[PDB]
Design an enzyme around this catalytic site. Structure first.
Site, PDB file in Angstrom:
ATOM      1  N   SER A 104      -0.755  15.531 -12.067  1.00 22.70           N
ATOM      2  CA  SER A 104      -1.021  15.177 -13.451  1.00 22.70           C
ATOM      3  C   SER A 104      -1.276  16.434 -14.276  1.00 22.70           C
ATOM      4  O   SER A 104      -1.818  17.423 -13.780  1.00 22.70           O
ATOM      5  CB  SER A 104      -2.213  14.222 -13.520  1.00 22.70           C
ATOM      6  N   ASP A 163       0.822  -1.203   0.000  1.00 26.29           N
ATOM      7  CA  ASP A 163       0.000   0.000   0.000  1.00 26.29           C
ATOM      8  C   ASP A 163       0.864   1.264   0.000  1.00 26.29           C
ATOM      9  O   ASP A 163       1.346   1.694   1.052  1.00 26.29           O
ATOM     10  CB  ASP A 163      -0.900  -0.020   1.240  1.00 26.29           C
TER      11      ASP A 163
END
Length: 330
Positions: A199, A35
């Site tokens: 992004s 994770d």
């Protein structure tokens, strides 16, 4: 040194991925959920409340000659999906894919929430976010990666998750055969303890690319792709009959649909998520309403590039002095 381990979807939907991890001496192999959005290595154990164990493999520290109780240490964690666990702490030898750390903090669960009990395939979590998020008290502990880093050939790990198929976590090297083209690296902020990056935009299907900054985290422990409501609405508007369902808890779509791809930007590069990666199947057994793999982050408070996005790429988690993230197509 290096390590390399195969990671395997837990079910036919790729709801999560499990990777075998050797703990203790002799080794006890547990299948952990790696994770990159958390920083605790915790396991089901011989100390876990019996009624809360249902099919998991447990770590029994009393059977490990290298286990040592970390005196006075406790841990307690709550995850974004509402699940939680807590317990005490041992140090022990932990190996992943041939890479060994001695003295790793292994957080033994005394209690786990129902979601964990109900998932027989996940024996615990191995956190790969920054150690500043580790919950051990009163002395915070380091992640497996943080402990291994100085010994690694290069201070990196990579995630290569498969779509409906196994993939690979590598530590200490970049497998140049595992991706196509080049890896595009992008800046990371560690201010919130995550692999947080921005992004450069998105496209839906064959549509034009929208240049827009989307700050979010690369999180292997989250199943879906959580993005701003504007972006998510633009995606689902291209699927006839798709709608946001408050009762179901997100966007659903007719199972008869063909889903468009979704592209996200990494600098000037582009990662394309095929439409089929966005199908999470019937909302309940036998239903013709299917759950979407792109969902709104509104009210999460952060955008999350979870498995839906990451499995479309070869992803480098670069733990150099100034960390960065790399993405390549594959």
């Amino acid at each position: 040194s290096t390590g390399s381990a195969t990671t395997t979807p837990i079910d036919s939907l790729d709801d999560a991925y499990i990777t075998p991890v050797q703990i203790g001496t002799p080794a006890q192999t547990l299948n952990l959920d790696f994770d990159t959005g958390s920083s605790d290595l915790w396991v089901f154990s011989s100390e876990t409340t019996a009624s809360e164990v249902d099919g998991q493999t447990i770590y029994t520290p009393s059977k490990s000659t290298t286990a040592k109780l970390l005196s006075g240490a406790t841990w307690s964690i709550s995850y974004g999906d509402g699940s939680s666990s807590s317990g005490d702490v041992y140090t022990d030898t932990v190996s992943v894919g041939g890479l060994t750390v001695t003295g790793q903090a292994v957080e033994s669960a005394k209690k786990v929430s129902s979601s964990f009990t109900e998932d027989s395939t996940i024996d615990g979590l191995l956190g790969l976010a920054f150690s500043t998020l580790n919950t051990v008290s009163p002395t915070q502990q380091k992640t497996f990666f943080d402990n291994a880093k100085a010994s690694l050939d290069s201070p990196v790990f990579t995630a290569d998750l498969g779509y409906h198929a196994p993939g690979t976590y590598n530590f200490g090297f970049i497998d140049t055969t595992a991706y196509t083209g080049s890896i595009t690296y992008t800046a990371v902020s560690t201010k919130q303890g995550f692999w947080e990056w921005t992004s450069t935009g998105y496209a839906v299907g064959s549509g034009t690319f929208k240049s827009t900054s989307i700050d979010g985290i690369a999180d292997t422990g989250t199943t879906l792709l959580y993005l701003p409501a504007t972006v998510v609405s633009a995606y689902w508007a291209q699927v006839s009959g798709a709608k946001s369902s408050s009762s179901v808890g997100g966007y659903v779509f007719p199972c008869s649909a063909t889903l468009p791809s979704f592209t996200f930007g990494v600098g000037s590069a582009r990662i394309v998520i095929p439409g089929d990666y966005i199908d999470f199947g019937p909302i309940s057994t036998g239903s013709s309403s299917c759950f979407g793999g792109i969902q709104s982050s509104a009210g999460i408070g952060i955008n999350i590039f979870g498995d839906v996005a990451l499995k479309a790429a070869f992803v480098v988690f670069n733990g150099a002095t100034t960390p960065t993230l790399g993405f390549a197509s594959k």
